[PDB]
Amino acid sequence: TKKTQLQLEHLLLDLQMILNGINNCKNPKLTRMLTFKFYMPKKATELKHLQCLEEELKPLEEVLNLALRPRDLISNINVIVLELFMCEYADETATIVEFLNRWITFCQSIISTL
Numbered sequence: 001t002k003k004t005q006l007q008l009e010h011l012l013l014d015l016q017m018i019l020n021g022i023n024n025c026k027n028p029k030l031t032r033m034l035t036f037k038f039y040m041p042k043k044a045t046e047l048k049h050l051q052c053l054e055e056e057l058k059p060l061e062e063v064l065n066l067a068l069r070p071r072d073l074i075s076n077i078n079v080i081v082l083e084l085f086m087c088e089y090a091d092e093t094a095t096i097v098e099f100l101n102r103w104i105t106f107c108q109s110i111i112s113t114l
């Protein structure tokens with residue numbers, strides 16, 4: 001359980017650092033990046049639901065590469081998810097910002113239980 005918490009936390013910082021680098025951009029730039037839509041998960045309250053994130057990693061990276069990072073934090077996160085059930089996506093897509101916040105919440109919400 002100890003190692004889990006530490007992986008989740010590392011996943012947490014990874015996502016927050018991406019969001020931090022994002023929310024620090026110039027507006028016009030952030031504006032374009034905010035045009036790209038990400039698929040959100042229907043449910044997401046158990047570790048098993050990290051499957052939705054893993055599938056959205058290549059896209060995330062793809063949107064990011066157009067713009068931290070070189071390309072290590074995405075791989076940091078992937079490794080975590082691959083180390084930490086049909087994945088169903090929600091109707092309406094979202095912004096890279098809302099995509100991070102949604103998983104940051106998820107991480108914090110799992111850390112709250114253990």
Ligand SMILES: *SCCON[C@@H](C(=O)O)c1c[nH]c2ccccc12
Pocket residue numbers: 021022023025026029030031032033063064066067
């Ligand atoms: S967080 C905003 C920084 O992103 N980079 C933009 C830029 O270099 O001006 C930029 C340009 N094209 C894209 C495409 C997708 C995301 C950001 C982009």
